[PDB]
């Protein structure tokens, strides 16, 4: 199980609702290979694939919780892949669009309790947790988040 599989999986709910084109996977993949987004966190690795293009139809976040850690290469240049178990796929129209959610997510990763609940809760429990967090943030209005954007992918 490779990074591509997790990217191509978290992008499926987006290409269904028609928030991204059918080649969006090819583009996050292609962007992950140029600017990897894998990060070290409390007990888990986090990754934040994203694509930013004219092929994005609306901004959306697709959250995936993996079961056995997958190696994403490191956002910051290090010799070691980050064993990622939590993935936040981003799709956005402009770079300001992504840089807003990007900042938002940093505080999510600095919220150890928020991050642990994710590892040990059901897909509906997760949706309501983030949807609430997205509601509290007015900078994040216009972002698309639905119950089908949460997925417990397994290796």
């Amino acid at each position, epitope marked *: 199980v490779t990074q591509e599989d997790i990217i191509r999986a978290l992008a499926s709910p987006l290409i269904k609702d028609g928030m991204v084109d059918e080649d969006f996977a090819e583009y996050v993949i*292609a962007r992950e290979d*140029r600017s990897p987004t894998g990060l070290q966190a409390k007990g888990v690795g986090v990754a934040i694939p994203h694509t930013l293009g004219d092929y994005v139809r609306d901004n959306a976040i697709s959250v995936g919780i993996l079961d056995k850690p997958v190696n994403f290469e490191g*956002w910051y240049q290090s010799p070691d892949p980050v064993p990622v178990r939590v993935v936040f796929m981003l799709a956005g129209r402009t*770079w300001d669009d992504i840089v807003i959610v990007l900042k938002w997510l*940093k505080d999510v990763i600095l919220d150890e309790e928020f991050m642990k609940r994710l590892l040990t809760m059901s897909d509906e429990e997760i949706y309501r947790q983030i949807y609430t967090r997205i509601s509290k943030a007015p900078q994040l209005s216009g972002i698309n988040f639905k119950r089908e954007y949460v997925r417990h992918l397994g290796t």
Partner: antibody
Amino acid sequence: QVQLQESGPGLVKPSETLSLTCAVSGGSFSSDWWGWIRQPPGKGLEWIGTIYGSGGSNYLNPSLKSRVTLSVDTSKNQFSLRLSSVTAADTAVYYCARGSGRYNIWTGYYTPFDAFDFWGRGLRVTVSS
Amino acid sequence: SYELTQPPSMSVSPGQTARITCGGDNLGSKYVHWYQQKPAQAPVLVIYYDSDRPSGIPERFSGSKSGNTATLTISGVEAGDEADYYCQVWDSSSDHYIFGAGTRLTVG
């Protein structure tokens, strides 16, 4: 080994539009920021603007904001420049460059390209009747 | 309305070091990138992000930063090291990328 080759008319009549195009063969055109910089004869380097490879995001020179538009064809690994209402001042050499960027979350630095790492050959444009 | 100040030109006889400098407001809080252009050639990035050095650039090329001022450092000065040397900065205010004026070389 990103290779950029410029292309365009090289002579343009005054008060007309300069159209140029850049063809990337480096490979990762969707994921990089591509730009234009020009150097007038015997002078320094002026950044014109830069556009995201997949389309969607432009950054332009505030003072040439009104005269410049930018486009990408991701499928052909090309991006283009359109300079309007051209003057003998726009007589310059025009390069295309790939962007260099260092994004640090935890810090908040997200400037999309900070330096121009790979440059192209340089097309000479002459504004003359 | 932002500008990068660097000496118009510099001479150095072979075998010495070089310390091409670049000045500007809050240049400590800004990243400085050095470019080298030779006659009939496009520039070549030799130092990016103050101190870091692009792949394929000899380690005799180095960069540093000092208060509101940055400085390139070309050790092992050779004869091929003749060029004009530019510095660039982003500068958040007035979202343009400023290139330095240029510091001519070729040393007698």
